[PDB]
Design a protein around this ligand. Structure first.
Ligand SMILES: *[C@@H]1O[C@H](CO)[C@@H](O[C@@H]2O[C@H](CO)[C@@H](O[C@@H]3O[C@H](CO[C@H]4O[C@H](CO)[C@@H](O)[C@H](O[C@H]5O[C@H](CO)[C@@H](O)[C@H](O)[C@@H]5O)[C@@H]4O)[C@@H](O)[C@H](O[C@H]4O[C@H](CO)[C@@H](O)[C@H](O)[C@@H]4O[C@H]4O[C@H](CO)[C@@H](O)[C@H](O)[C@@H]4O[C@H]4O[C@H](CO)[C@@H](O)[C@H](O)[C@@H]4O)[C@@H]3O)[C@H](O)[C@H]2NC(C)=O)[C@H](O)[C@H]1NC(C)=O
Ligand SMILES: CC(=O)N[C@@H]1[C@@H](O)[C@H](O)[C@@H](CO)O[C@@H]1CP(=O)(O)OP(=O)(O)OC/C=C(/C)CC/C=C(/C)CC/C=C(/C)CCC=C(C)C
Lengths: 120, 29, 644, 283, 34
């Protein structure tokens, strides 16, 4: 059934996110040492070592991934057929899903560049 | 709302809060 | 000139003109891409791993010959030794020695273990096309073949300069799916015999077939519950099962194991239940659904369950190495950029048009996701999976959206997918240059902007061992450098990586111990001539036996004194690590703080050893039981003239 | 303040179907259940960080601790944080209140000048769902707890004994005076504010009569302006009882802690339930 | 012998040529009937 697909996409970001860092769990975001004045500002996603993450890093990554895929699901399931409201609902659907697609890929590109320092 | 600026007006207000919140926090740490 | 281009007889012929065009220059890409890791620096072998393979590789073209010669060595593992009873898989080696049976007859041995992997990639990107023809389309694979041609992590673990034991296991595995999936789709049993004969090539090389028979029958188990049996599942499945078991039975690593281990034993139980359920379907379809089929249904069920009871009664440093630890999205999306995004897409399409063949790939999309959740080294198993279904996914999205127009939404949706996807091939071009274009035996250093220091202490020291040492010798340092010492040195050794005898490795921890009087006695037990250790102190990011020293510290076996208690000394006595003057004094009397350190108070200044950011100041020059054998060029390895 | 003003008055003459106001209250009440639905943080007590009355909390709790009997006991009798017995009672209240929304009085109507169409006018007991009458019950007890701040100069103690509920799951908690006066004030306040409320925001006797004459709908039994006396013997009682057995109903929202937020959550989802009817109306 | 960066630009243009030509295939395959 399609509920099995629901189960799998549920499992998707669940084991993209943090099952690897369930036992190696590293707490969410604080690592600044006063930087000049202000003591313990929580920093970010980890950047210097590549393999590590925190809980807050992983969840964000997983969320970015499944929304993109299910945006393509929405492109398939409704935008290619022609049955519903042919000027109001459809245009919304392609609009927000194209927004999903473009801004999602853009921000994930940003969230690999800034933790990664890769030449873009 | 013959016009949509009232919404835009609300957005402006949040930005004023949004930006002005961290704007004083710029000089602090 | 010659304007007859796009009016040739396309979809029949110019179809194939474009087909074989992509099957040329896409396959160019995989082999070409691997190359700049060895074009940039090396000539022969990057990692430490291909040395132990390369030695026996050139052996089994020099003198050994597998059908008439397996082989024994006393050169490794003094005094125990290891032989082709271990090292699962000559499928690398027989491949390489076959290639320079042939091409050497056509006329080198340098160029056969280093050029091989690019070759593997090229071949694999053409077998993935003939695979993906069978799934959606020939059009589905023509974007999918490029995907495994330049998925950079699959490039990364098999680069130009790789010769890993799983270096061509992937090709076999992929091939066995071409050799399974139109046997399932068409029960052609000559062709399924060709399938099992291909399976033997995988079941040689790398132990992922313990994975594969975790995969293939339990997939079949899925086809119980979805109920989509036929003959043409069954008639193809019995062949590669039962004949494949005997072809595994030929091999030693899996030996009488295909009788006995908990995975493929349950796979055998699944084969038995499958062949019963085929037979059950056959009978009882000539008879009615009477009462008496329920009666001997009870009879045959009780005989089957008592078979289940008789079966259930009778049931007969690696973690530390940084890569076997679990990985996040960096191995992920850093690994597999656009091709993560498209992974559910075709999978949705595979749950849209859920055909008979595609459910196997869906199970293969589940399982390898679950397994590359824990080992980034196992990431290679998910290396083509993603490229399969994303290969479907774009070829769904593209097909539906060049559908609509030329026969404004498609004036975006086609138009994004170029720059959406080809940014991928920017990433694949260059992440391959960043992380993975660096060998293990030659370390790139820092310090200048023009003609900067980027320099070969391993070949300097190992080639000292290959000139100025006796023939019969000792090599003992630590196990993860065990093959390379057998690369150029031709020197007899005690330990090595694998780890089939754990006790033999555990008394090397008492050879790298606290008490020099007992450690040197354990040395004198084990026929010493030479000892090695590696530094990393004054540039940091190199390894060695001082940061896997915690591993040595807690390694414990056949011991009662010292190595019993995991602390031994090494903490500040509240329980925190220090090594220096503020460190701990039995560590000062341990080996590795004096084993390594001689005359280092006298050479560097300004309070360094960048690994610890340590200090000069210990007297620390006390060779109670040894002498120096190599005063170093770049503090690299102090070779130990083992003194009486 | 001006923003909430503009958003409410652009959802009365504008879109407005529920209100601006009542659907704000409803959605914020959805959220106040929802923070109790999944709950990420907990400041660590004597044991057991990061699990405060979520079902995820009572699913992560099974993953951490052994001795699953004392994993059940903390799941079902959790006091200081939200509880899952609390969530069962919260669900239970939702079911009963929609049992009582469907209480309605039917009145069939021969339309004037058309043969026998019977679009029967109903009178539901909740009777505008008392978005006046509960907020009548709420905001007077909010304005003094605003103006106890002027009592600090010229209190949370002695003034509280007739101000608030007694907050205790122990029904025989240490003051029956506070309990009796609180419940009697709740019941009497909603009933009294029904019998005073209906005279202003519509649907009193003359209101209904002039709307039905104004939309040409006449009761069959008698003459058009006897319709008043046809239905004047329903609307006040279906005000008053319609007041009364909401507040006592909110007694059952407090007497048993099955409410994520209490009284108010019962009644903002009652807003939603009437709200669904309003949206459906135009189909 | 060719350099590293020349090979990088090589792989870039080859992959771009490859994927665009895939799109061209996918057009010719979707358009012309069976
Ligand atoms: C992986 O690597 C591992 C490390 O490299 C490797 O592990 C090693 O494996 C070898 C092979 O088995 C082990 O050697 C054996 O160890 C036995 C352990 O005995 C312990 O307990 C005894 C008391 O119960 C102690 O006596 C004994 O030694 C102590 O005393 C010594 C002298 O004082 C001293 O040097 C020791 O350090 C220690 O203090 C130890 O503590 C040991 O019993 C055994 O000795 C027998 O075998 C030797 C030949 O293999 C003979 O030289 C020796 O004299 C003994 O011979 C007996 O057995 C023979 C047949 O086995 C007979 O022919 C002999 O006549 C004699 O038989 C007498 O005793 C029999 C009962 O045992 C009886 O049936 C007979 O009738 C007769 O009465 C041997 O040394 C080694 O210990 C392992 N090391 C470690 C660290 O684990 C492992 O094998 C590798 N893995 C693989 C798969 O290969
Ligand atoms: C040069 C060298 O050292 N070779 C040795 C080799 O000779 C030796 O036999 C071997 C063992 O010592 O190790 C050296 C070579 P290697 O490291 O590549 O082998 P390895 O350690 O066995 O590697 C193991 C990798 C695998 C891919 C095997 C399977 C791993 C598993 C965790 C089991 C999975 C279970 C399944 C049902 C499969 C499907 C997956 C699901 C359902 C999640």
């Amino acid at each position: 059934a399609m509920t099995v697909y629901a189960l799998v996409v549920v499992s998707y970001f669940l084991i993209t996110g943090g099952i690897i860092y369930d036992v190696i769990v590293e707490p969410p975001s604080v690592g600044s040492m006063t930087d000049e004045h202000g003591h313990q500002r929580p920093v970010a996603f980890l950047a210097y070592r590549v393999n590590g993450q925190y809980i807050m890093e992983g969840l964000a990554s997983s969320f970015l991934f499944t929304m993109g895929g299910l945006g393509f699901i929405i492109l398939d399931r409704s935008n290619a057929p022609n049955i519903p409201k042919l000027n109001r609902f459809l245009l919304l659907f392609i609009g927000f899903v194209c927004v999903l697609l473009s801004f999602f890929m853009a921000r994930v590109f940003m969230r690999m560049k800034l933790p990664g320092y890769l030449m873009g | 709302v013959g016009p949509v600026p009232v919404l835009v007006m609300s957005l402006l207000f949040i930005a004023s809060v949004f930006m002005l919140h961290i704007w004083g926090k710029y000089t602090r740490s | 000139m010659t304007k007859l281009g796009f009016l040739r007889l396309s979809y029949e012929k110019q179809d194939t003109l474009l087909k074989l065009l992509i099957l040329s220059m896409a396959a160019v890409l995989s082999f070409s891409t691997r190359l700049f890791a060895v074009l940039r620096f090396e000539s022969v072998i990057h990692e430490f791993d291909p040395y132990f393979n390369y030695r026996t590789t050139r052996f089994l073209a020099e003198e050994g010959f597998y059908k008439f010669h397996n082989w024994f060595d006393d050169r490794a593992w003094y005094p125990l030794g290891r032989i082709i009873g271990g090292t699962l898989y000559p499928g690398l080696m027989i491949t390489s020695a076959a290639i320079y049976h042939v091409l050497h007859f056509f006329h080198d041995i340098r160029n056969v273990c280093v050029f091989l992997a690019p070759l593997f990639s090229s071949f694999t990107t053409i077998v993935t096309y003939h695979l993906t023809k069978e799934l959606k389309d020939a059009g589905a694979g023509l974007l999918a073949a490029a995907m495994i041609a330049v998925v950079p992590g699959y490039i990364s673990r098999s680069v130009a300069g790789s010769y890993d034991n799983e270096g061509i296991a992937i090709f076999c595995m992929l091939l066995t799916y071409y050799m399974w999936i139109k046997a399932v789709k068409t029960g052609s049993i000559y062709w399924a015999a060709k399938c099992a004969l291909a399976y033997f090539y995988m079941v040689s090389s790398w132990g992922g077939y313990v994975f594969l028979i975790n995969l293939i029958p339990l997939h079949v188990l899925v086809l119980m519950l979805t109920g989509r049996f036929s003959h043409r599942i069954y008639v193809a499945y019995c062949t590669v099962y039962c004949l494949g078991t005997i072809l595994s039975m030929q091999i030693s690593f899996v030996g009488f194991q295909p009788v006995l281990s908990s995975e493929h034993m349950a796979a055998f139980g699944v084969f038995g239940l499958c062949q019963i359920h085929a037979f059950v379907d056959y009978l009882r379809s000539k008879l009615n659904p009477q009462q008496f089929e329920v009666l001997f249904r009870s009879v045959i069920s009780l005989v089957g369950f008592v078979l289940l009871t008789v079966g259930a009664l009778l049931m007969l440093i690696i973690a530390s190495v940084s890569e076997h630890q679990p990985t996040t999205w960096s191995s992920y999306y850093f690994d597999l950029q656009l091709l993560v995004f498209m992974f559910p897409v075709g999978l949705y399409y595979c749950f849209s048009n859920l055909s008979d063949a595609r459910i196997f790939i869906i199970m293969y999309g589940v399982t390898s996701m679950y397994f590359s959740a824990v080992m980034v080294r196992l990431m290679l198993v998910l290396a083509p999976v993603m490229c399969i279904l994303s290969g479907i996914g774009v070829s769904q999205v593209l097909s539906t959206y060049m559908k609509n127009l030329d026969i404004e939404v498609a004036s975006g949706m086609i138009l994004v997918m170029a720059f959406f996807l080809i940014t991928y091939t920017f990433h694949s071009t260059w992440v391959t240059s960043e992380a993975y274009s660096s060998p293990s035996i030659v370390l790139s250093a820092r310090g200048g902007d023009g003609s900067r220091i980027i320099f070969d202490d391993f070949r300097e020291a190992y080639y000292w061992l290959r000139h100025n040492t006796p023939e019969d010798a000792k090599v003992m340092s630590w196990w993860d450098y065990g093959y390379q010492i057998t690369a150029m040195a031709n020197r007899t050794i005690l330990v090595d990586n694998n780890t089939w005898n754990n006790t033999h490795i555990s008394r090397v921890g008492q050879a790298m111990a606290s008490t020099e009087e007992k450690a040197y006695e354990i040395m004198r037990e084990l026929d010493v001539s030479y000892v090695l250790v590696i530094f990393g102190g004054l540039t940091g990011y190199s390894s060695d036996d001082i940061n896997k020293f915690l591993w040595m510290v807690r390694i414990g076996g056949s011991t009662d004194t010292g190595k019993h208690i995991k602390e031994h000394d090494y903490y500040t006595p509240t329980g925190e690590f220090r090594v220096d003057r503020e460190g701990s004094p039995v560590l000062l009397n341990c080996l590795m703080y004096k084993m390594c350190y001689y005359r280092f108070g006298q050479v560097y200044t300004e309070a360094k050893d960048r690994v610890r950011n340590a200090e000069i100041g210990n007297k620390d020059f006390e060779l109670d039981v040894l002498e120096e054998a190599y005063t170093t060029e770049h503090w690299l390895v102090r070779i130990y003239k083992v003194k009486d | 303040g001006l923003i909430v003003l503009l958003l409410d008055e652009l959802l009365q003459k504008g879109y407005g179907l529920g209100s601006g106001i009542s659907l704000f209250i409803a959605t914020n009440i959805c959220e106040t259940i929802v923070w109790k639905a999944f709950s990420p943080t907990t400041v660590n007590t004597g044991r057991g960080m990061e699990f405060e009355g979520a079902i995820i909390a009572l699913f992560h709790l099974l993953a951490t601790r052994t001795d699953k009997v004392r994993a059940l006991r903390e799941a079902f009798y959790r006091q200081n944080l939200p509880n899952l017995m609390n969530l069962i009672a919260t669900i239970f209240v939702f079911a009963v209140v929609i049992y009582f929304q469907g209480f309605r009085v039917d009145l069939p109507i021969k339309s004037a000048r058309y043969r026998g169409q019977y679009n029967t006018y109903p009178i539901k007991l909740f009777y505008t769902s008392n978005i006046p009458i509960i907020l009548q019950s709420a905001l007077v007890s909010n304005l003094y707890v605003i103006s106890q701040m002027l009592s600090a100069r010229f209190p949370v103690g002695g003034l509280c004994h007739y101000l608030s509920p007694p907050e205790s799951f122990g029904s025989v908690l240490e003051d029956p005076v506070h309990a009796v006066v609180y419940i009697v004030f709740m019941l009497g306040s909603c009933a009294f504010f029904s019998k005073t409320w209906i005279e202003v925001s519509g649907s009193s006797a003359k209101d209904v009569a002039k709307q039905l004459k104004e939309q040409q709908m006449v009761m069959r039994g008698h003459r058009e302006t006897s319709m008043v006396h046809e239905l004047n013997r329903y609307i006040p009682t279906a005000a008053a009882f319609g007041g009364l057995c909401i507040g006592a109903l909110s007694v059952l929202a407090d007497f048993l802690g099955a409410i994520g937020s209490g009284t108010g959550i019962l009644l903002a989802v009652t807003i939603i339930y009437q709200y669904f009817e309003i949206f459906v109306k135009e189909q | 012998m060719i350099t590293d960066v020349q090979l990088a630009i090589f792989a870039n243009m080859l992959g771009v040529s490859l994927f665009l030509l895939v799109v061209l295939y996918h057009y010719v395959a979707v358009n012309n009937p069976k």
